[PDB]
């Protein structure tokens, strides 16, 4: 069918043409061993799910009922940061410690400026395979970017 033909001939055309270096600055992605161990590192810092958020809020409401702490019974979170405008603001504020960029964002113009911005602001970046992998890292479908900004000792 035509959808199969279009989705094959499109990736045929995208290498038949001479791509300008801002594209194919991608497609040198991370190798699989270092990618596996960086996702193993990132899996320890996962954002909270809805149920554990809900019991966290019940514990906070009980704690401000009994002791009236200013929402400070729970400790400081340590989570991976995601969302494109969020991590661009983090990179511009120099708060990001390590940024992962998905290699298959389907407007590529959403993420072509990201390695140059990371190089200018001095933040280390890695083009990694799988916006679906980043999404299952941050409990979404697709995430298209991820960032560690502050890590435990």
């Amino acid at each position: 069918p035509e959808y199969v033909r279009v989705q094959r001939q499109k990736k045929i055309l995208s290498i038949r043409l001479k791509v300008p270096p801002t594209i194919a600055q991608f497609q040198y992605t991370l190798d699989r061993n270092t990618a596996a161990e960086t996702f193993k590192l990132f899996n320890k810092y996962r954002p909270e799910t809805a149920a554990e958020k809900k019991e966290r809020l019940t514990k906070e409401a009980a704690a401000v009922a009994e002791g009236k702490s200013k929402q400070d019974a729970s400790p400081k979170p340590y989570a991976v940061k995601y969302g494109l405008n969020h991590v661009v603001a983090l990179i511009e504020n120099k708060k990001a410690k390590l940024v992962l960029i998905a290699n298959d964002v389907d407007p590529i113009e959403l993420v072509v400026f990201l390695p140059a911005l990371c190089k200018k602001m001095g933040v280390p970046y890695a083009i990694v395979k799988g916006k679906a992998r980043l999404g299952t890292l941050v409990n979404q479908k697709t995430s298209a970017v991820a960032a560690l900004t502050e890590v435990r000792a």
Binding site: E2, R5, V6, Q9, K10, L13, S14, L17, V19, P20, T22, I23, L84, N85, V88, A89, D106, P107, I108, E109, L110, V112, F113, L117
Partner: protein, 203 residues
């Protein structure tokens, strides 16, 4: 904020990155139908600046229309009149290709409401637009008072009555001395200044 990067990158259309990307996407859009549903906006910054929000009930279609003039549809070029009206070839349509694109999209999805449109690509034969549409029956637009004005029945076929942005541009609706013919409606002003007003006690 990535959206201003997307804007100021989008203004460099003859940069090599954008003309490569344009060259791939225009082939991809010729391979599809003339009117087809886009899954997400190609320019999300442009969509949300024209008024799109990524929630349920906001629909994007993609559309191509034929470029060039409007040939006068007469048999064998005979106009049967004075020589000032014998022109056939170099006549121009008074509305825009963006306008006829979103009007065909509205006829395709008559249950939706056309909000805006934007240029995405072109070649010698076609111009390519993306049309933002909002569903006035979805409860997320029945509620959300920022957008429930589109559910009022006076907004049926705004693109057909020329009430979108390019429709008002083509109708000439603007303040100023350059728009004296077309300011409250051309035919309305013509009737207003071609009416003969007679009072009871004749002035």
């Amino acid at each position: 904020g990535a959206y201003k990067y997307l804007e100021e990158l989008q203004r460099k259309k003859q940069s090599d990155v954008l003309r490569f990307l344009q060259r791939v996407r225009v082939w991809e859009y010729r391979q599809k139908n003339v009117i087809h549903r886009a899954a997400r906006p190609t320019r999300p910054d442009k969509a949300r600046r024209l008024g799109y929000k990524a929630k349920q009930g906001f629909v994007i279609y993609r559309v191509r229309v034929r470029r060039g003039n409007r040939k006068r549809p007469v048999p064998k070029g005979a106009t049967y009149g004075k020589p000032t009206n014998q022109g056939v070839n170099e006549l121009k349509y008074q509305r825009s290709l963006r306008a006829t694109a979103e009007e065909r999209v509205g006829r395709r999805a008559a249950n939706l409401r056309v909000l805006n449109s934007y240029w995405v690509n072109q070649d010698s034969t076609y111009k390519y637009f993306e049309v933002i549409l909002v569903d006035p029956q979805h409860k997320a637009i029945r509620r959300d008072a920022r957008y429930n004005w589109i559910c009022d029945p006076v907004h049926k076929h705004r693109e057909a009555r020329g009430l979108t942005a390019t429709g008002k541009k083509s109708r000439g609706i603007n303040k100023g001395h350059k728009f004296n013919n077309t300011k409250a409606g051309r035919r309305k002003t013509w009737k207003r200044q071609n009416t003969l007003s007679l009072w009871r006690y004749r002035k």
